[PDB]
Symmetry: D3
Subunit: 152 residues, 6 copies
């Protein structure tokens, strides 16, 4: 689609505690995507329950929210062509037992409840998650010096 | 299912000769598995033949045994949930021709007779290999400081 | 001194454009320091002139401010024992021509006007830079799961 | 099947511009393949048109040749068993959207027109591409010290 | 001066706990030194007190032995020309505050009591430490395939 | 001073044999220097003797020449401000015993007769070595997409 597509990527509290902030950012950075927003944050419980509002009936919802509250979160917005779908491919399968080596979860995660990172699963959910986690002023506008070498 | 499942991972003499001990250990270390036993050994021929007992009448058996005798072996025991199956996924296909990049054999190996590493193919074979290569006191009991961040 | 000492580290616009956000964060992360605040920001010219207010009489001041405005900045606050002095050691000499390999500038920078990163040179300047760049609510409070293994 | 098979790998101008010469070479070097020829060249227009002669009727042909002329190319010849097929697997799918993480394009590329690298798709085309890009005297004959550890 | 010199390198419990076994081994492996013995052990109290016998009058002696007992240790014997002196340089200064980036402690450690690794400080002390931590049968004799390329 | 200063960097046969082409290129590539010429060559004895002409009556001259003939050499020309002096700093001390970790020889070499790489010691010697190893048309003229972010 368009090279200005954006997605929401968040390093979960287990990824921060295990020192994976650098490696995870390098995966998207080396792929050619543009970081337009990033901040370390500890959101309230109500925001995390809204982020996972589609899973409010799951049995693991209560444990998921409390685990997302157990530490800081590195919330990011990455911009690039097909960055939503490609971003999920970089993260790996939701259950890292089903993820392939070379992906984030395939290299670092074991339990589905401790899968290190989060990524938007659709363009519409990406826009809803970006507006939920970031203010419009936190989206930084700039052009990469190698844009014409990453994109045709 | 059980987070205390154990598998036997061994760096074959070609992996030792090519300076791959560090990177191979980092594959399991960065994934979140616990190293409970490790030693550099040059095991006798009988132990290696007992290790590959199910392949005694294979055409490549004699060559496999002498090649496993041609250099030191880094024998390891890794502990973690589904470490047996996931460990095999980390190693890649037995023939690195069929292995995917991002795995150990997919990044370092070419020939099936020089596939760099070994991994237990099942839980029962893992217990038999662990008892064959390691004495019980050589398995170290300890608790990882990030156990609760790797497992839910 | 105290293990709660904080310093201000910022990835300059040249470091962001060249894709060094991941590697730089990994230097402090692998050393054992705790990231307590981080955000991607494009500060106004007045804030950057206050950040370098001690150099308002330098001939390179006008070019320094405009260069700091040419792209986004990854502003960070790292916490750890002697993190101010050790942080400068990790960055390297101000002129990367005088920096040693293994440091950030020793591995990535050439020109002093394009030295990729910034670091506070004293505890007092660190407190002034932290309050200048970050709001008090952006400092996230948490304890690393390996704190007792990094510190005695 | 034979260990003396050769393929032509070429780092495209976008790969050179984005500082990927080192990492791409390490992918084949760490796998066990032998570098027998390499040079940084800026070939004439007629050479690139012959390289993609089978795509002369494609609508993107003129733009492909023009973009391949816009910068230097790191032309290489790698030798090893099944190096053509395995080399293609290391590069990843032609469209980086379909490429897997762990491959070259899966880690570094996004656009099909900016897939940073090229590899021969067959042994016949490899010989034709090697004869087109290299003089026979530029292929260096040597024996790797770890040959007997890579191959059985 | 002789290439058969041996030193004792030991990854301390904090190094094991922080997932640094792989990276530390790669430091010596990539330099050209040969691993002739390695094991993951949890030594008794009397062995650690003999290891630091020269520091029995230090005030931090009791705490040092207790902390060295609090987790597993990766005991290693590396062989190479001037491996004792060069090994100390690779580890870095005893106090990580004085260590340089690029060394093990300069990249991973902060506290003197948590410097993640140990190395023999002399050839005489290396022989004493090797005889204390390893049985003679645990030192594997082999010839590196790149020996004639590491040494003249 | 001049950003178009050029130096001659060559990977010696031991560096090629030990699979160090990728990492060595990344040292100069990540620092921000521009690769303008590169080729894998097996130069004749006379060229190598002319390269080390100032050492003709040294005791190690004959051994140095035959060792430089024993394998392929990756000859390169790198361009950048103070690339000659900084390039030598990246390589480390001639005797890797005296070299610091973080440099090429400090991370990969042990013996002075096997110090992996070569670098021009002065600007005038660089011009003489570049003309000795490379034809003028083999030097590629191009502009890095991040030139204005590496240099002020
Ligand atoms: N069975 C489970 N047990 C515990 N946690 C789970 C389970 N399934 C999903 N989760 C957690 O809930 C989050 C939401 O998962 P979901 O949105 O369905 O997939 P994804 O987050 O990969 O798009 C996941 O990131 C995962 O950490
Ligand atoms: N056709 C073959 N030729 C040579 N060696 C082989 C062949 N098949 C298997 N081997 C070697 O024998 C070992 C045992 O193979 P097997 O146990 O069947 O696969 P895995 O090691 O993946 O469990 C392999 O690691 C491989 O190195
Ligand atoms: N001579 C110079 N020319 C251009 N820019 C300079 C020069 N000296 C310093 N700078 C820039 O001004 C910034 C402030 O430098 P200074 O505060 O003196 O050292 P540091 O920032 O390393 O503590 C530096 O980060 C550098 O990028
Ligand atoms: N639809 C397209 N649009 C733009 N460029 C393309 C397209 N398809 C292929 N190319 C370019 O043409 C080159 C030749 O493609 P092809 O030979 O079919 O794939 P491969 O290079 O993987 O063998 C590719 O490397 C790619 O950069
Ligand atoms: N002042 C101190 N406080 C706490 N621990 C110390 C102190 N000095 C040394 N140690 C510990 O004792 C060990 C032995 O120190 P020493 O042998 O003098 O240095 P090295 O281990 O570099 O040879 C060190 O590894 C260090 O962990
Ligand atoms: N004493 C020695 N013994 C063996 N080889 C040596 C010795 N001194 C130098 N050499 C080799 O000769 C080459 C030329 O040395 P020299 O030019 O003086 O240092 P540099 O290569 O750092 O400029 C070195 O790269 C080294 O490999």
């Amino acid at each position: 689609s368009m090279s200005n597509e954006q997605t929401f990527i968040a390093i979960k509290p287990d990824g921060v505690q295990r020192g994976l902030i650098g490696p995870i950012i390098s995966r998207f950075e080396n792929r050619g995507f543009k970081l337009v927003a990033m901040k370390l944050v500890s959101p309230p419980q109500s925001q995390l329950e809204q982020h996972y509002a589609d899973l409010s009936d799951k049995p693991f919802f209560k444990g998921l929210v409390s685990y997302m509250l157990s530490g800081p979160i590195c919330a990011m917005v990455w911009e690039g062509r097909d960055v939503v779908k490609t971003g999920r491919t970089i993260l790996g399968a939701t259950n890292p037992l089903a993820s392939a080596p070379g992906t984030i979860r395939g290299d670092f995660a074991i339990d589905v409840g401790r899968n290190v990172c989060h990524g938007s699963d659709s363009v519409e959910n990406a826009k809803k998650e970006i507006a939920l986690w970031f203010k419009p002023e936190e989206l930084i506008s700039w052009k990469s010096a190698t844009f014409d070498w990453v994109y045709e």
